[PDB]
Amino acid sequence: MSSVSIFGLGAMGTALASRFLEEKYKVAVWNRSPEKASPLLEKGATLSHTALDGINASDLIVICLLDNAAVQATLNSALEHLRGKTIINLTNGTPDQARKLSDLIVSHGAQYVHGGIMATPSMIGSPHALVLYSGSPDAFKTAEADLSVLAKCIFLGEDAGSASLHDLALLSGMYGLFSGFLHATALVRSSTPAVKFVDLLVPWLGAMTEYTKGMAKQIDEGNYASEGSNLGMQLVAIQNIIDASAAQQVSADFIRPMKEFMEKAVVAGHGGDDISSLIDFVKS
Amino acid sequence: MSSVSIFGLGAMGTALASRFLEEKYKVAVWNRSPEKASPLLEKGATLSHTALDGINASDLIVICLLDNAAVQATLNSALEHLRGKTIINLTNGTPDQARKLSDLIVSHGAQYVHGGIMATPSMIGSPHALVLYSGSPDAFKTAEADLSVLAKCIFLGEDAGSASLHDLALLSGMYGLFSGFLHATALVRSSTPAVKFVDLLVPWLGAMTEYTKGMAKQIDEGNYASEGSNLGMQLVAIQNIIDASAAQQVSADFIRPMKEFMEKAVVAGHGGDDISSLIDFVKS
Ligand SMILES: NC(=O)C1=CN([C@@H]2O[C@H](COP(=O)(O)OP(=O)(O)OC[C@H]3O[C@@H](n4cnc5c(N)ncnc54)[C@H](OP(=O)(O)O)[C@@H]3O)[C@@H](O)[C@H]2O)C=CC1
Ligand SMILES: NC(=O)C1=CN([C@@H]2O[C@H](COP(=O)(O)OP(=O)(O)OC[C@H]3O[C@@H](n4cnc5c(N)ncnc54)[C@H](OP(=O)(O)O)[C@@H]3O)[C@@H](O)[C@H]2O)C=CC1
Ligand SMILES: CNC1CCCCC1
Ligand SMILES: CNC1CCCCC1
Ligand SMILES: [Mg+2]
Ligand SMILES: [Mg+2]
């Protein structure tokens, strides 16, 4: 009685398909390279030999492809067969790509929800997974029970591009954290095992992640008066990081953006302010 | 009976001096701009009118100045009066600066410990504060009871530059996290309050901070085989972050280093590997 049709059997699409199968859904699967379907067919999925077969397999279509060019190309042949269906697009893309694809899909008589998967494939089906959704509220509402098999759901509203905006912002936070981890580990690699260093680093990153909640407060209030850690002193520290990196033949490129934004803010009069003040200098 | 002599009454030196006073130490204080001493003198500190007075006030000298040029300049007049003293230098600097200053100080008959304060001034005296120390093991041992008034202590060994290496690496981790927070908040600023967004961001950064412990494992083992999140797919995601940033007139400079390192690794054959593989590409 419960059915879904999946497009994309990469790492993530495979994990989606596997989870629906585990929960005894009727699951159709489609992939450009159809041999990625075999492990799923053995577990009870039906192969969509063509994209149109996948469109006709269910009124709930879940797409998870590399990029939204692949999504458009895959659907293009079948756009006249989308009437009445719900498209859940989990492909990473920009807000604008989701808004334009939403317009196209809605013009063909279907409804569109975009989703940003904040999880790795192994996390699918666990309480640690979260998917951010936006687009059709009606379609999300009627599909929510099915989507909750994959992950916790947060619905962000009717703008089809809001899920990808929030996804890409969360990923940009991640990439900053990973940039810092790689820089830090590279600096100590010749001295300390990385596993030994992360016993220092992880608690420290936790403490600095806590310093962010109040930074968000300062940002929402426009109040950057230093609480003890001024930018002049921080620019010296950053230059010491740059210089120590060079001495060890480690690249300091990860921290040069921060130095440049901090220098701009200091030129503008923030040498005695906190780092939240940089929010006004990250434009352009 | 318990005494200390502090050099530097900036934000951090003031917090050190205040904490020792609270614990009923005899505390001498020195600062280039001596009017920063008044709040401390009112609480029972003695003013060092000259650097030599500060050197002669105690055999435990704690220095906390902007940079190690200020440290050298401050001590230079008094180098012949350091015999028998312990210098605890908490000034941020490079490993080499600490090694050279250590050599100079030891040549003048004193002992030298460098310290990296992993705390803000308000954290001094709390269990959340940590100071990383390296240099003379004997001097650290006999001063440890006094230093523990400020913060938890970790001693890293006899290399006078190890405390600053580990400090600067931890700070580089911090700056990566803060780079990601600023990028993320800048992207959503026009859509969402920052305080609302951090309710998503903080748990997410926690989950990604956990992903780092296994990354350290992969690094120490040289084994980068993907567990589900390949670099080819990540480079697409990063480009989507760059493009979404431009559309919103937000700078994407924070993530360009990561894109460049990831592109280099993919050229070298890691398109199907995990992000830990970048550790070999952050050189130069
Ligand atoms: N950790 C993860 O892996 C996460 C992934 N995501 C997102 O999920 C999506 C899928 O990622 P993931 O499964 O990891 O990526 P993969 O690299 O494992 O798989 C990419 C998928 O896209 C397909 N594809 C690529 N180009 C085309 C094309 N031109 N036409 C049709 N299909 C094509 C591939 O088909 P083929 O098999 O034929 O090559 C494959 O199904 C991405 O948007 C990613 O950002 C989100 C969160 C986490
Ligand atoms: N959150 C923080 O504030 C933290 C700071 N630190 C480190 O602690 C150190 C002190 O930082 P903080 O107190 O915040 O910085 P401040 O900017 O508040 O104070 C800087 C101090 O250095 C002195 N100084 C600067 N140039 C000279 C000079 N040429 N000769 C003599 N003294 C000079 C200033 O004297 P004057 O008052 O006369 O200007 C002042 O005492 C730095 O190395 C920093 O990295 C470590 C961790 C956290
Ligand atoms: C040296 N820079 C400081 C370190 C402690 C946190 C705030 C910034
Ligand atoms: C889209 N890139 C992925 C997101 C989830 C964590 C690993 C990297
Ligand atoms: Mg392509
Ligand atoms: Mg100076």
Author numbering:
A (entry chain A), B (entry chain A): 1 to 284
Copy text verbatim from the article accompanying this structure deposition:
Two of these IREDs were found to be active; IR-09 and IR-20 exhibited >95% and 47% conversion, respectively. A crystal structure of IR-09 was available and used to identify activity site residues that could potentially play a key role in determining the stereoselectivity of the reaction. The crystal structure was obtained as a ternary complex with NADPH and N-cyclopropylcyclohexanamine. N-Cyclopropylcyclohexanamine is a considerably smaller ligand than 3, thus AutoDock Vina45 flexible docking was performed to find a suitable pose for 3. W204 was found at a distance of 3.6 Å from the ligand, and a similar situation was observed for M233 and Q234, which were at 3.7 and 3.4 Å, respectively. As a result of these docking studies, amino acid residues W204, M233, and Q234 were targeted for site-directed mutagenesis (SDM) with either alanine or serine as the initial replacements. W204A and W204S were identified as the most promising variants since they both gave rise to a partial increase in diastereoselectivity for the cis diastereomer and, most importantly, they both generated the previously unobserved (S,S,S)-enantiomer.
Imine reductases (IREDs) are one emerging platform of biocatalyst30−34 that perform a variety of reactions, including cyclic imine reduction, reductive amination (RedAms), and alkene reduction (EneIRED). Interestingly, individual IREDs can behave simultaneously as an IRED, a RedAm, or an EneIRED depending on the substrate used while still maintaining excellent chemoselectivity. A reductive aminase (RedAm) was engineered following a structure-guided mutagenesis strategy to produce the desired isomer.
